[PDB]
Subunit: 233 residues, 6 copies
Amino acid sequence: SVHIEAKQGEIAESILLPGDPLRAKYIAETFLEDVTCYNNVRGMLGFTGTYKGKRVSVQGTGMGVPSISIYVNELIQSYGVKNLIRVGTCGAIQKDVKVRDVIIAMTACTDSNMNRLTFPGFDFAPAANFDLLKKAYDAGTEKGLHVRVGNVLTADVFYRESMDMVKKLGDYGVLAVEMETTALYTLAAKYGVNALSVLTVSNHIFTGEETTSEERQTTFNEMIEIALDAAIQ
Amino acid sequence: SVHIEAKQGEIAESILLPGDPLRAKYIAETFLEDVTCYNNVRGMLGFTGTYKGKRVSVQGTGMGVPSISIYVNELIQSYGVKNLIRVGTCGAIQKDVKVRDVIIAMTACTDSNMNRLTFPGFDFAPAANFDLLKKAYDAGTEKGLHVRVGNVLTADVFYRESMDMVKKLGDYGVLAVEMETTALYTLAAKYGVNALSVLTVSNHIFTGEETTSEERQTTFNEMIEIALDAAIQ
Amino acid sequence: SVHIEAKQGEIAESILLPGDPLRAKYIAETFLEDVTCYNNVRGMLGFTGTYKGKRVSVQGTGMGVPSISIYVNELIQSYGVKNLIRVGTCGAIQKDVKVRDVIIAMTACTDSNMNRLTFPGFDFAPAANFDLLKKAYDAGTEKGLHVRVGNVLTADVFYRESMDMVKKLGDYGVLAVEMETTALYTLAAKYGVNALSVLTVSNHIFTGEETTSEERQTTFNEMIEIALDAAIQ
Amino acid sequence: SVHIEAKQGEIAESILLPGDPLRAKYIAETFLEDVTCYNNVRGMLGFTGTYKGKRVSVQGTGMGVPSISIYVNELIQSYGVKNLIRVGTCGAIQKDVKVRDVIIAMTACTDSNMNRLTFPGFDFAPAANFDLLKKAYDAGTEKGLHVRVGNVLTADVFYRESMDMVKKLGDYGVLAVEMETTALYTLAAKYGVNALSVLTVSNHIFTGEETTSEERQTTFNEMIEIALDAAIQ
Amino acid sequence: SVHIEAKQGEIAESILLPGDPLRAKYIAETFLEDVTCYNNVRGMLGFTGTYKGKRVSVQGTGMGVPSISIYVNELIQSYGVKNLIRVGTCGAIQKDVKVRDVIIAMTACTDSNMNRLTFPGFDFAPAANFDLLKKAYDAGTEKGLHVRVGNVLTADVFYRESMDMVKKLGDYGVLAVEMETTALYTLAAKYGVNALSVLTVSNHIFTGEETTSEERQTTFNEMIEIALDAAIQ
Amino acid sequence: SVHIEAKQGEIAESILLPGDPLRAKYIAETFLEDVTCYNNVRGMLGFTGTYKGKRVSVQGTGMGVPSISIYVNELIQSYGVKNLIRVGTCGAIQKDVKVRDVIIAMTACTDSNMNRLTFPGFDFAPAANFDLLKKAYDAGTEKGLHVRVGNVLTADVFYRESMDMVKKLGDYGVLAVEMETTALYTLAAKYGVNALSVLTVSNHIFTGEETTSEERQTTFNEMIEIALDAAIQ
Ligand SMILES: O=c1[nH]cnc2c1ncn2[C@@H]1O[C@H](CO)[C@@H](O)[C@H]1O
Ligand SMILES: O=c1[nH]cnc2c1ncn2[C@@H]1O[C@H](CO)[C@@H](O)[C@H]1O
Ligand SMILES: O=c1[nH]cnc2c1ncn2[C@@H]1O[C@H](CO)[C@@H](O)[C@H]1O
Ligand SMILES: O=c1[nH]cnc2c1ncn2[C@@H]1O[C@H](CO)[C@@H](O)[C@H]1O
Ligand SMILES: O=c1[nH]cnc2c1ncn2[C@@H]1O[C@H](CO)[C@@H](O)[C@H]1O
Ligand SMILES: O=c1[nH]cnc2c1ncn2[C@@H]1O[C@H](CO)[C@@H](O)[C@H]1O
């Protein structure tokens, strides 16, 4: 496809979608066997390998609705992918949400115009595939993680001048901010395939608490495991 | 409160919310013991009774976002209600969704302006309480119902001149149309309480299939049972 | 029709539209002769009778744009109704407007999306039928009421978190808030029939003054009389 | 003021507002006695004189919401004007509306953003002063004109690429298109003064019928008379 | 055309567009030879003459997007005009912008709805013809003027209740406010012809500094010269 | 900063901004001397080196408004960058625009919501720094390139279901589609620094013509040269 140099059949039907291509590399090296790298266009690494015997892929998406939309469209339309699980990080916008929690997004709010253009006059609420959601929830519960299932904000702006609306969304139960889920969930629904986002809380936007990769790695490793499990089912 | 004549403490913390007040009467008479009627203002019947030993209420809401918003605000703010389960009907907008299916709404799309006013420039995706959702899903699964968990449209207009956008929403996986869920889910989130909508598919909007109350009553009875169960937990 | 169980011909061509079905009952019992009840679906009472010798009907609408839109569509499209007069209550948003005033709405502002969906990019100003308006004005003037003719707000939300915009509308001459007129006037215009809203001011939103039904009943009775008069002409 | 060179007190409290400054000149010369010209800034002629003994003014506004808004703000805020009557022309968008009809605008629809900016999320329906409206209606009725009272479109674009929405507005009872009323009515309401628009239908937009000034002059003269009458009361 | 009484061929292919028709008269009398007046409809003077031997026209537009849109549509579509240069005034909204500066608009922001209607869901950025822009820039540079090339605001409202957004636009580099450029640039682009706006700063909106025509006339004369030069090339 | 691991002072005040980090590597290796790599976070390579003796940097941005906004905010606010030139590719949406043309964006249209959120009710037209624009134009003219200066579309969606609006924008003179310029120009203006986008046309969206990197490399090399030149001045 335009942004992926893989041949037909090189990408598995189940795929993990980190935003960072170097995290795709880490996931492939850490968890998968019999690994090939099928893409390095724009440095946006993608790999296929085996986990507990099943083929699976892992593909960086880049940051933001427009970037992930490019990759998700191509994966679905050109490579026949069926199950797509974003594995990422997010910033908590509730005191009750803690750094190192794992959030499974039921749905996402957004300040993107992508869906207002598609459905003029409507608020489109992009939804997770429930069967994948339940599988990940059950796997994370059994893995012993603090799993929260709820709403997130998919933001176009990482650096927002006023935080008033983000605070207000938090007061309406929105758990955390990230930059991709609306697009993944909307496009998967469009094409009749299955999507989920599973996120590690890496910082709290209003307390200023933050972590490096190393400082959240055990939780992050465990989260990848339950994303892979929800994939291989 | 302005629209409910009950005294403080007459309404239980868990409540079922049919749109039709005569369905509230049917539910109270059919399922509950030790029943009182606490409201007849505007004919919008409300009852409290016991089911398998636990107090519970049932309150008509009327039709549409503005009507249910009035009742939900008053129930939460004046009567201290904690768990709110809409029990209603809907029209399928997918061929794969069948009349007599039970839909549990994860989230809702809308053509209402209610949330655009509250969050200018954003698409707010109103979400179910996951713990209530899981309890209802498990109860309906065990009850032997065809349960579908997904997205619905909360419409302001029952009679829409063009169906183009409703068809398009169906192509993006939206299961059915109804007229209340956005408001229930948004207000419950605002106030930190727990909401869910559990709906019986009564007609298919694009095939013209339809049912009377009697023609869907066994399914509807079973749905009330699993809404009550998710309530008494 | 879907929400009205009347046979063809049971509903008169001229109809009064209170929001409260129990007010429809009161109006029929108090003012009409030879009364039949033609509907009790959803408890949304409707009656036909005679006033000073002419057939007329009275039909509850419920609260809010979506509810009244259902009834008005069915009345016009399935029952051939020609003259529709909402008879209701409202909350004043001007100090100069007094409780027990009667407001005849020339037009209505709204926070509903109903017309933005129909006319993308435009502000649709829903207008009263002038001939009905003049007849009601003349009848109320002769009846000795304080009649104010002007603009109202048709609100989707009864409980608004911030009142800033309602105050601002008051500063631009908007007289009172209610929850139905935009829909009645828009739909009547769509179908080429005649509509009017005639409202009793029951409270002042910024002074906190309020009334019970009994405390405004003489004014309310007189208002029904001039709505009926504007109907029988 | 910035756009009017008159001294304080040179402009009467009642004023007619044609769009064309040469029509202001015609009105002053044809109907008024003891006439002064108080403005020629930008060629936007304004005059004060006497009609049946009462002082009155007549001021061109130019075409479009932004132009008339400039003049109306200055007249109200700098010159203390109290009663403002636009006297203009319009294009019919209904077959039932005829060239040479006089339309008295109850309210106006618009494709302008002026009110969406002022009232975010709301549709503001700009309304005529009813007392002035009734006075003009009664005067036109007695004068023997075909007077229509209803809704108009205030357009930003005279040359619209697609007429679909103008046709649709006609199907919802909107009588004619012009380019000023929304602004006049909104600003008068803002400042607590009295406004009305009284328009001669000069063309039918969908039949192509049209008139020159001379071809509608008797009707136009009669309309000025009843605008002046509604002014001097 | 509807608003211009000229015969075919009476208007030159290159035209200057002041807002004030009396400025069109001043420009023709001051700079042109062999002058004819081809229009006085609505007092909106238009002239054709010769400058340094080349035919050119000058046409008042009136104030605001709707007024200039009428004239620009007719000039382009009925009179075959090819090069259109608005010559006007503006109010500075930056301290760094000085009264008597000449601004050449690259593009324009707006609070008009004109382009949102044409391109639903998009922000259309109306752009100058670069070749004309460069010619005017070079001519003004050589003439010894303080020329600033940048962004302006095309406003619908001259009298804005809150200046917050105008201040904010200034903080994003917008130089000045005027009332026509969006429309000129958009329509010229639509029809494949060449437009530019060249403006004299006449006042500073936040310091209150202001000028009369006489007080900026030398600069204004020099600006007309470089607009004419960019025209005759 | 959060997404760039460079120390203070490692990034030059003038910077080129390709979307593809591997193009940043190519630019540094091909054109610069004394090169350091200061960033590999997320694989988003950034380099500093010397060109004709002046320090300069080159930093990948990723694809889309949200991605480039992250990098541009950090470069400006944390690293003190002053001159930012996007060097990228685009798809032509005019027949008159040819593959291998170089477009210098004066301004950009968008379907992003980023500026509607910042300036509610307004169309913000993001503008290039004119001084940088002129320097690049002059350099490209002297280099012998086909340089077009005009408007572009900054799109959120690479894969758009309907092309109707893109075609319409082309009919209004918009030259090409890309995915970053609105954000670069808006943020540079916010912070008072200088930005430009210089793009090679790599494909024609409506003819299907396309190129590989190798097939446009001579033009692309020449474009980098004139972006660097406009930088070192
Ligand atoms: O606090 C946050 N705000 C926005 N995005 C975040 C946050 N935390 C993690 N991400 C995620 O990391 C990238 C941006 O750095 C995006 O991919 C986003 O989804
Ligand atoms: O097909 C449908 N469209 C809209 N609402 C429906 C449909 N089916 C059931 N409801 C539900 O019944 C009432 C309206 O009659 C509303 O309360 C709505 O939620
Ligand atoms: O102050 C008010 N706000 C909103 N609606 C009102 C008010 N007063 C009367 N109504 C009317 O009563 C119902 C809501 O209780 C609605 O039908 C509305 O039209
Ligand atoms: O058909 C019409 N469309 C738009 N405006 C019209 C029409 N007829 C009359 N006017 C009026 O004349 C000026 C424009 O020529 C505007 O002032 C408008 O109000
Ligand atoms: O400060 C200003 N605000 C708005 N428009 C201005 C300003 N200065 C000059 N103009 C210009 O003059 C007319 C309005 O008086 C308009 O044509 C506008 O473009
Ligand atoms: O035809 C096009 N549409 C959208 N973006 C394009 C096109 N051609 C080049 N780009 C540019 O390349 C990346 C997307 O592949 C984006 O960075 C965009 O700016």
